[PDB]
Design a protein around this ligand. Structure first.
Ligand code: HEM
Ligand SMILES: CC[C@H]1OC(=O)[C@H](C)[C@@H](O[C@H]2O[C@@H](C)C[C@@H](N(C)C)[C@@H]2O)[C@@H](C)C[C@H](C)C(=O)/C=C/[C@H]1C
Length: 393
């Protein structure tokens, strides 16, 4: 039983060697996450892609040996933590809001938010800033908050709750944060009743009130929570991890600067090279599963390591090479199967507009600290930085 906790920041900063080491012996391994969670890891691209879409692996806690806590049980009635038919029904409720055509209409506004954030950033007399605080965090929370209808003065509370979910001081902090967020969402939800709002939450509230059978109040709350949190810590880290990748690879940054039509390709390679999701969300086998000899008992917690999949040579030649011109087709940065990220088009839009704005307005943009000085968060499911110092002329 490998204990990831005893590996420290060394493993947090560069977990790849550890994963590949495990991939060499087999596809599934038992480990102890930093928080003390005894879980299973699935490494290797082929096995990883298969498991993500293998119906034998449920996301419904009723099939999990580990029980939900009281505060967690208040938010699990959402699509990411359910199997069909519930999943089918819940996702249908919002699929239409996230199509590429629907998201494209948001381009003008996303552009506004980015230009404003960059305007403010370039106001620094020293030509220095923390990209995490100036853009990576502000952009994502602003967009999703406007789509759902979260008042501006309430958006700060989320960075706090979100942090307590990722790198909580103690187990209790996370639980308290959930209870608070849970209480806030219920109040936000109730405040929309009778107000004729046209934001997504208001529509959902109307749907639930009209027929509690199509969307129960537990699910309304669950839906509001998943849409706000599943795309927060992820888009934030994509922007930051992606810019770090570019800034730590001068040659690639130059090629993109020279030819901006490589942008879309650059963004995909960022997802594949330094995607924010190191490990997918909890899966629980509904029956004992045998992965090439290793048997994962029913009920155990399983984590598909997307990061290791992205470094499998057979799938991505010269894995450790960050190449924006590389063939990325097949990466699992957004998952695979029925739970495939519903916010992918919106994630891609924000990332594309943010990367272009920095390259075209920050002359001689450069990393303002050495790669080795950067600090990464411990949590195995999330790949993200504590801060990203940058500078320009
Ligand atoms: C670059 C940013 C993003 C990445 C890399 C990402 C990644 C993922 C991944 C890996 C999954 C499935 C994981 C699993 O199967 O356990 C997923 C699911 C999901 N994502 Fe994203 N996501 C991002 C942005 C977004 C955005 C912007 C939203 C919100 C608008 C969002 C909403 C969701 C939801 C609600 C699900 C559940 C889908 C379902 O269960 O049917 N994601 N995302
Ligand atoms: C969709 C990929 C990202 O994951 C999340 O957003 C997960 C689902 C979210 O997980 C947990 O949030 C709690 C508030 C409720 C809990 N459930 C038991 C009711 C749910 O599993 C994040 C808060 C967890 C991780 C740490 C994260 O920040 C994002 C990870 C992405 C992989």
């Amino acid at each position: 039983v490998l204990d990831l906790g005893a590996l420290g920041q060394d493993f947090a900063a560069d977990p790849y060697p550890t994963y590949a080491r495990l991939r060499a012996e087999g596809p599934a391994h038992r480990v102890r996450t930093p928080e003390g969670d005894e879980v299973w890891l699935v490494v290797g691209y082929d096995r990883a892609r298969a498991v993500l879409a293998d119906p034998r692996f449920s996301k419904d806690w009723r099939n999990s040996t580990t029980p939900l806590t009281e505060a967690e049980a208040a938010l699990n009635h959402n699509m990411l933590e359910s199997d069909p038919p519930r999943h089918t029904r819940l996702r249908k409720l919002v699929a239409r809001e996230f199509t590429m055509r629907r998201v494209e209409l948001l381009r003008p506004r996303v552009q506004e938010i980015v230009d404003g954030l960059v305007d403010a950033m370039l106001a620094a007399p020293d030509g220095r800033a923390d990209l995490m605080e100036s853009l990576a965090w502000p952009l994502p929370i602003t967009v999703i908050s406007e789509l759902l209808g979260v008042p501006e003065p309430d958006r700060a509370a989320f960075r706090v709750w979100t942090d307590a979910f990722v790198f909580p001081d103690d187990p209790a902090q996370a639980q308290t944060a959930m209870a608070e967020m849970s209480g806030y969402l219920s109040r936000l939800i109730d405040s929309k009743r009778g107000q004729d709002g046209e934001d997504l939450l208001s529509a959902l509230v109307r749907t639930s009130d009209e027929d509690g059978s199509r969307l129960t109040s537990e699910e309304l709350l669950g839906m509001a929570h998943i849409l706000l949190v599943a795309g927060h810590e992820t888009t934030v880290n994509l922007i930051a991890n992606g810019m770090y990748a570019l800034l730590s690879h001068p040659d690639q940054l130059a090629a993109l600067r020279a030819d901006m039509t490589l942008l879309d390709g650059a963004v995909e390679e960022m997802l594949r090279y330094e995607g924010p999701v190191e490990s997918a969300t909890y899966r629980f086998p509904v029956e004992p599963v045998d992965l090439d000899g290793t048997v994962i008992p029913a009920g155990d917690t399983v984590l598909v390591v997307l990061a290791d999949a992205h470094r499998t040579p057979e799938r991505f030649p010269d894995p450790h090479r960050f190449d924006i011109r590389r063939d990325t087709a097949g990466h699992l940065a957004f998952g695979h199967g029925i739970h495939f990220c519903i916010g992918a088009p919106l994630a891609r839009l924000e990332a594309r507009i943010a990367v272009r704005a920095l390259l075209e307005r920050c002359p001689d943009l450069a990393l303002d600290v050495s790669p080795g000085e950067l600090v990464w968060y411990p949590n195995p499911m999330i790949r993200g930085l504590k801060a990203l110092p940058i500078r320009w002329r």
